[PDB]
Amino acid sequence: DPVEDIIRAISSATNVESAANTTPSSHRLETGRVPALQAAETGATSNATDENMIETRCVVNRNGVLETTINHFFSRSGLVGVVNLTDGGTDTTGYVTWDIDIMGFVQLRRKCEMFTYMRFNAEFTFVTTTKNGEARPYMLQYMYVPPGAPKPTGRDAFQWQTATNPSVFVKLTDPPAQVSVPFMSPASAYQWFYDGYPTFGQHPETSNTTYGLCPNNMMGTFAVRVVSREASQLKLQTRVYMKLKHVRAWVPRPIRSQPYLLKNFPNYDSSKITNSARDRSSIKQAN
């Protein structure tokens, strides 16, 4: 009472179960009404349509729109990692850890990077074979070591007691292991691009190795062993396939045309930039 100055989105949603129909349109002879002329300086795309440009027939369109949703586009398993467990003769560790980063393999990386923010679940399958290829009847242990948890120091070391860490016991002759994983980010979404630094302080101008590394993506480590006492002589790879499910996506961004170099960095060649479209002989020959 004594001091008065103290006292939405335009876009909406619509279900689309099939491709758009086409209504019939005849010609137009008159002034003042001009569907063709656009001005792109407003950042908005041309709203001109089939039916105001030419004369059209009527098309009932039963083409399905369904397969292109982000759920169906992103729910497929593809390789996020490869782990090499020697365990054999000579120098023998007896186990191998793999930090969980799905940016290590390009084919599934470029699909994710269409988007800035993502919130999903996961389905991991572990396909393990021997050096060339085979399956023998050896028991395996796949253990998840979340951030802050002790990493195992040896084949038999006590960190494999896994009274808490989830683990999978499986034989090489069994069908590949599989589990469901939740959304574990301490933020509200995963983000594949973080423009910023994780901590305060003075940042070197010569080499910034901390630029662009989001803390919220550090999920812990995956570790393998052969359950045993002495050692085996075999040598095996485990391939790791991640499926995305229940996925949501935000803020689409352009698709990367340059060859990747590093996992965690978008470094590209200042020399050698490859053109996004192949070159022809002349602009006047379509072919």
């Binding site: 989105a9 335009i10 876009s11 909406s12 949603a13 619509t14 279900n15 689309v16 179960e17 009404r33 001009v34 569907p35 002329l37 656009q38 001005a39 407003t42 950042g43 908005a44 795309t45 709203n47 001109a48 349509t49 105001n52 729109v65 369904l66 949703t69 759920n71 169906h72 729910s75 679940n121 469901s180 994983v181 939740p182 959304f183 499910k245 229940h246 689409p252």
Partner: protein
């Protein structure tokens, strides 16, 4: 269409957890107007954009 009395069951879940389940329930929702035409003053297709 068709498929008379096919008794489909998928989404039934065997675990006490929601993320154990299987996609989707789909979604048919679209809003292209936020990416394609994100302008304050609405512009009709008949009128010229700039007057």
């Amino acid at each position: 269409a068709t498929g008379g009395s096919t008794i489909n069951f998928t989404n039934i879940n065997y675990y006490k957890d929601s993320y154990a389940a299987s996609a989707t329930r789909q979604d048919f929702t679209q809003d292209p107007k936020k990416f394609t035409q994100p302008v304050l003053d609405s512009i009709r297709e008949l009128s010229a954009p700039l007057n």
